[PDB]
Amino acid sequence: MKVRASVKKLCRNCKIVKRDGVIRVICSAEPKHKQRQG
Amino acid sequence: TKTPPAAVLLKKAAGIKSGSGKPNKDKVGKISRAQLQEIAQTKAADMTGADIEAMTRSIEGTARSMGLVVE
Amino acid sequence: MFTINAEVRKEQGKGASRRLRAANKFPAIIYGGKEAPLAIELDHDKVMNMQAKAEFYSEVLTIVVDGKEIKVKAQDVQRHPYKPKLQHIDFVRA
Amino acid sequence: ALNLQDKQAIVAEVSEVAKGALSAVVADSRGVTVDKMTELRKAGREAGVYMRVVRNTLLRRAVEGTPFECLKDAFVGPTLIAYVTEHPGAAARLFKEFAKANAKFEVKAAAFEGELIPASQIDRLATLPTYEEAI
Amino acid sequence: QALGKERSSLEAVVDTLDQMKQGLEDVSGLLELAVEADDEETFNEAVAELDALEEKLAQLEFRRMFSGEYDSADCYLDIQAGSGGTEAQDWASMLERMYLRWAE
Amino acid sequence: MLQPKRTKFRKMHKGRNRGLAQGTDVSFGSFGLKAVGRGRLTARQIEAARRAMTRAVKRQGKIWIRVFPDKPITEKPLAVRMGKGKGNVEYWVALIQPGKVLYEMDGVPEELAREAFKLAAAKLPIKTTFVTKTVM
RNA sequence: AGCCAGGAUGUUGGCUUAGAAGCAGCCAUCAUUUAAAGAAAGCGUAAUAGCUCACUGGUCGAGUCGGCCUGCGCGGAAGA
């Protein structure tokens, strides 16, 4: 999990979701691309 | 077996051993359209164009890529 | 053909003309040829979309001003100096 | 993808080819790789077959131009059309060796004499000879 | 990786040396094949074969001759006299005026 | 690092920075980076941003720099019980008003130039926009 | 938007490279097949292959794609 104030879609597979107040980036195809906004 | 590549049969036709380092600016040979049709008709086993002019423009594509003008 | 409607202005000056850009209009002027100069006001969005096209500045335009058509060229244009807007257009009569 | 004006070019172009066309064959597109699809269209332009695929709501406008309004039931599902200008029959043999060699897909109809002919009765159009039988 | 690299070295020597046996048999042939028909213009135009083959062989030598990273560079030379008084110091000069007169 | 060759005076007043900019139009090129806020570009900033956009076009193109750092700026060294004169000139700045065009490009397309001026914008302290040329 | 099928041929485009076959780097702008496909969008091989998007027909049946201007909000946000 990468935690950082600028979250961004890296691949084409990455998808931005808002869960419980918080922007995440779920990627299927790459576990590295998992991000959260703090 | 197949007929040999279009890059090898253009190198004999121009009279060189390897092509151009920076193509289309730099030019390293020449071919007239009698030799373009002989290279087209020797490859006429492999090529998927039905006519000749159709086969010849495919060979012109490899000639542009390696520096050879069509004199 | 680029058609514009207008209105003659009652007011003018700093206070008046800043109230226009609050109300999504803006002021312009028609001068040139013979007559008295005329003070007019224009919907901002209409004339923003028109002046996108570069034929605005070549062509002759057609300002309706209480019925009377006038045929005019876009002589000069002040832009607001960072946001994409307009603060004023001079229209010479052709 | 396209304008309303670009689809008006296709209604004029495919209606005009239907006048020159004696026979015509509806077929299927899917299943087949481009190596084996292009084998249909090489031997197509030997026997003289102008192969097309056109959109299937669009072809009701393009094939109003007569007498091939027979083939309006077929445009539900996939449709590789053909329009054979010179040489009658021709395509109807080649669409059955296209069907057998891959061994997939439908092959629906084939319009000759201005009439719809269903799938099992194409044997007549398939076992026509060359034009050019009497010599 | 290392075996294909070592083949790439040993191709560059064995290809270039065998085609200079056959290439100087070609030139000693085709200069002398211009003398058989005996035209003095074909005698001089077949010399264009040799001066192509000269700077393949002269650039194979240059690949051995120089080799390490510094062999392009400018150099210093420090001649030093040994240990025998004057006779040694004369020998040192004798050199200096040798390496100067061959760097000329 | 930009810096006048010689001046009259070594040191300058602080001044203020009110009002809007002259140099609003994109004259020299096709595209440009207009400022929207209000501050000082140092000379190191102006350079860092040129090296971004220069890198990013692969040297196609031409780039013009429209602003020049010609105000000097002093600092006192650390521990200086105030007074005892004005400090030394550490570094140079341009002052920027809302509406000044800073960079201009042409000889690239609007795909690439948007990306070049995005990469510059991250080095500058002031909020910026992309502008194309207007015909009048 | 989803769903099924096709994404080829000269050709590993050329040049570099132990290798460079669309996909280390550098130079670049073809026709052919026609439903259409980059002389290549991302994974990946020592390299091919492998997967897959642009592109395109099928299916399905009403609004939809994404910039500009403006209001109020979210994260960014740790101390005795």
From Swiss-Prot, chain A:
Query: Do you know which PROSITE patterns this protein is assigned to?
Result: RIBOSOMAL_L36
Q: Could you confirm whether the keyword Ribosomal protein appears in this record?
A: yes
- Give the keywords, sorted: Ribonucleoprotein, Ribosomal protein, RNA-binding, rRNA-binding
GO BP terms: cytoplasmic translation; translation
Its Gene Ontology molecular function terms? rRNA binding; structural constituent of ribosome
| A GO CC term attached to the entry | cytoplasm
Entry-linked HAMAP family:
Ribosomal_bL36
Q: How does it assemble?
A: Part of the 50S ribosomal subunit.
Chain's role: One of the last ribosomal proteins to be assembled in the 50S subunit, it contacts a number of helices in the 23S rRNA, acting as molecular glue. The simultaneous presence of uL16 and bL36 probably triggers ObgE's GTPase activity and eventual dissociation from the mature 50S ribosomal subunit.
Q: Which family does the similarity line name?
A: Belongs to the bacterial ribosomal protein bL36 family.
Q: This chain belongs to which protein, by name?
A: Large ribosomal subunit protein bL36A
Q: Please name the source species.
A: Escherichia coli (strain K12)
Lineage summary: Bacteria, Pseudomonadati, Pseudomonadota, Gammaproteobacteria, Enterobacterales
Task: Tell me the name of the encoding gene.
Answer: rpmJ
Curated annotation (Swiss-Prot), chain B:
Question: What does the entry list under GO cellular component?
Answer: cytoplasm; cytosol; cytosolic large ribosomal subunit
Q: Which residues carry this modification: N6-succinyllysine?
A: K2, K11
Q: Name one GO biological process term.
A: translational termination
- Keywords, sorted A to Z: Methylation, Ribonucleoprotein, Ribosomal protein, RNA-binding, rRNA-binding
Output the Gene Ontology terms for molecular function. large ribosomal subunit rRNA binding; rRNA binding; structural constituent of ribosome
Q: What does this protein do?
A: Forms part of the ribosomal stalk which helps the ribosome interact with GTP-bound translation factors.
Q: How does it assemble?
A: Part of the ribosomal stalk of the 50S ribosomal subunit. Interacts with L10 and the large rRNA to form the base of the stalk. L10 forms an elongated spine to which 2 L12 dimers bind in a sequential fashion forming a pentameric L10(L12)2(L12)2 complex.
Q: Which family does it belong to?
A: Belongs to the universal ribosomal protein uL11 family.
Question: Could you tell me what this protein is called?
Answer: Large ribosomal subunit protein uL11
Which organism is this protein's natural source? Escherichia coli (strain K12)
Gene from which the chain derives: rplK
Q: Which part of the full protein is shown?
A: 71 to 141 of 142
From Swiss-Prot, chain C:
Stored InterPro entries: Rbsml_bL25/Gln-tRNA_synth_N (IPR020056), Ribosomal_bL25/Gln-tRNA_synth (IPR011035), Ribosomal_bL25_short (IPR020055), Ribosomal_L25_dom (IPR029751), Ribosomal_uL5_bac-type (IPR020930)
Name the SUPFAM superfamilies for this protein: Ribosomal protein L25-like
Q: Name one GO molecular function term.
A: 5S rRNA binding
What are the alphabetically sorted keywords of the record?
Ribonucleoprotein, Ribosomal protein, RNA-binding, rRNA-binding
Tell me which domain of life the UniProt entry assigns to the organism this sequence originates from. Bacteria
Q: Cross-referenced CDD domains, in alphabetical order?
A: Ribosomal_L25_TL5_CTC
* GO CC annotations, alphabetized: cytoplasm; cytosol; cytosolic large ribosomal subunit
UniProt KW RNA-binding keyword: yes
Instruction: Give the quaternary structure.
Output: Part of the 50S ribosomal subunit; part of the 5S rRNA/L5/L18/L25 subcomplex. Contacts the 5S rRNA.
Q: What task does this protein carry out? A: This is one of the proteins that binds to the 5S RNA in the ribosome where it forms part of the central protuberance. Binds to the 5S rRNA independently of L5 and L18. Not required for binding of the 5S rRNA/L5/L18 subcomplex to 23S rRNA.
Q: Which family does it belong to?
A: Belongs to the bacterial ribosomal protein bL25 family.
What name appears for this protein in its UniProt entry? Large ribosomal subunit protein bL25
Species annotation: Escherichia coli (strain K12)
Q: Give the gene that encodes this protein.
A: rplY
Curated annotation (Swiss-Prot), chain F:
Q: So which domain of life are we looking at? A: Bacteria
Q: Which InterPro entries match?
A: Ribosomal_uL16, Ribosomal_uL16_bact-type, Ribosomal_uL16_CS, Ribosomal_uL16_dom, Ribosomal_uL16_sf
Q: Which residues cross the membrane?
A: none
Q: Tell me how the protein is altered or processed after translation.
A: Is hydroxylated on Arg-81 by RoxA. The modification is nearly suppressed when E.coli is grown in anoxia.
Provide the GO biological process annotations.
cytoplasmic translation; ribosomal large subunit assembly
Q: Which residues carry this modification: N-methylmethionine?
A: M1
Question: Which PROSITE patterns does the record associate with it?
Answer: RIBOSOMAL_L16_1, RIBOSOMAL_L16_2
**Which residues are annotated with the PTM (3R)-3-hydroxyarginine?**
R81
List keywords of the entry alphabetically.
Hydroxylation, Methylation, Ribonucleoprotein, Ribosomal protein, RNA-binding, rRNA-binding, tRNA-binding
Gene Ontology cellular-component terms for this entry are: cytoplasm; cytosolic large ribosomal subunit
Which Gene Ontology MF annotations are present?
A: rRNA binding; structural constituent of ribosome; tRNA binding
Of which family is this protein a member?
Answer: Belongs to the universal ribosomal protein uL16 family.
Q: Which HAMAP family does this UniProt record tie to the protein? A: Ribosomal_uL16
| Assembly | Part of the 50S ribosomal subunit. Cross-links to the A and P site tRNAs. Interacts with assembly factor DarP(YjgA).
Which NCBIfam families does the UniProt record give? rplP_bact
Summary of the function given for this chain in its UniProt record: Binds directly to 23S ribosomal RNA and is located at the A site of the peptidyltransferase center. It contacts the A and P site tRNAs. One of the last ribosomal proteins to be assembled in the 50S subunit. The simultaneous presence of uL16 and bL36 probably triggers ObgE's GTPase activity and eventual dissociation from the mature 50S ribosmal subunit. It has an essential role in subunit assembly.
Q: What is this protein called?
A: Large ribosomal subunit protein uL16
Species this chain originates from: Escherichia coli (strain K12)
Q: What's the encoding gene here?
A: rplP
